[PDB]
């Protein structure tokens, strides 16, 4: 409606199998538009599906009219699953990381280096 999308610095990155650009969002009297809404807006703009569209790093200007972020559209979901960072791929629910802290892993590692042999697999 009153939220309009423009794409500025467009580049067809054929090496990472994508098209990447700066996304400029106009929303004169609302809050910062969520990333999902921008994703269907880019999917309508570029005649594609929104599960290959990844947007990130949005900053709203002082005054509120405008928000700039970066976005990139992958050719397939497989190139998205290869070339995207794991955390941006997790923001879309496509990746789940291990739920262990550094202290736990580091103490486990230092405990199992006091043990020789396959009993290494028995140290918690």
């Amino acid at each position: 409606d009153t939220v309009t999308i423009r794409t500025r610095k467009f580049m067809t990155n054929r090496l990472l199998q994508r098209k990447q650009m700066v996304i400029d969002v106009l929303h004169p009297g609302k809050a910062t538009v969520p990333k999902t809404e921008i994703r269907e807006k880019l999917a309508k703009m570029y005649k594609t599906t929104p599960d290959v569209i990844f947007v990130f790093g949005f900053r709203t200007h002082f005054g509120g009219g405008k928000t700039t972020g970066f976005g990139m559209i992958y050719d397939s979901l497989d190139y998205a699953k290869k070339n995207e960072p794991k955390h941006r791929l997790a923001r879309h629910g496509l990746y789940e990381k291990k739920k262990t802290s550094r202290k736990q892993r580091k103490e486990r590692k230092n405990r199992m280096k006091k043990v020789r042999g396959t009993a290494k697999a028995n140290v918690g």
Binding site: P28, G29, H61, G63, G64, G65
Partner: protein
């Protein structure tokens, strides 16, 4: 080692003699004329003027056709003209030595909001800018000391979002209008 920069500058000078009557009265004159918060804004503008005068003097010690004099004098003159402190017909370095603090005080956003008839006073202008009602071009500017350029002088207006501007009523008015 950190990925930080420590480069930072004091932007004013405290005077050498603290209590002299003439300087105190002239500072109070400027504060009252321009609606400045304290003496430090007078000292800040006085500092930028002193820097510009030192630059112009060191350029004037050079001989006339010295290429550093031409390049840096043209840059300094162009900037002073671009903020409207020097007239366009006075592109001579010696005229820089004739300027006063009042010119850079006239080029503030507080003063330009007062002189464009958006405010009833100079203090009303400082209050008007500080509360997000004034927009230069299409950008809400909150800073009274924002120095306005000549290409930005004819574009100072009221925020399309302000109650005095585009027109959504404020907190007090919406509170009072729903009592009845």
């Amino acid at each position: 080692p950190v990925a930080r920069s420590w480069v930072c500058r004091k932007t004013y000078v405290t005077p050498r003699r603290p209590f002299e009557k003439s300087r105190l009265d002239q500072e109070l004159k400027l504060i009252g004329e321009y609606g400045l918060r304290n003496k430090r804004e007078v000292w800040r503008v006085k500092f930028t003027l002193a820097k510009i005068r030192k630059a112009a003097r060191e350029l004037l010690t050079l001989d006339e056709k010295d290429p550093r004099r031409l390049f840096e004098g043209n840059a300094l003159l162009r900037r002073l003209v671009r903020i409207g402190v020097l007239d366009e017909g006075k592109m001579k370095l010696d005229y820089i030595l004739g300027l006063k603090i009042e010119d850079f005080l006239e080029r503030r956003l507080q003063t330009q909001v007062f002189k464009l008839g958006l405010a009833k006073s100079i203090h009303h202008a400082r209050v008007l800018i500080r509360q997000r009602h004034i927009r230069v071009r299409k950008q809400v500017v909150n800073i009274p000391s924002f120095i306005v350029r000549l290409d930005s002088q004819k574009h100072i207006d009221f925020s399309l979002r302000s109650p005095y501007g585009g027109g959504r009523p404020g907190r007090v008015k919406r509170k009072n209008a729903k009592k009845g």
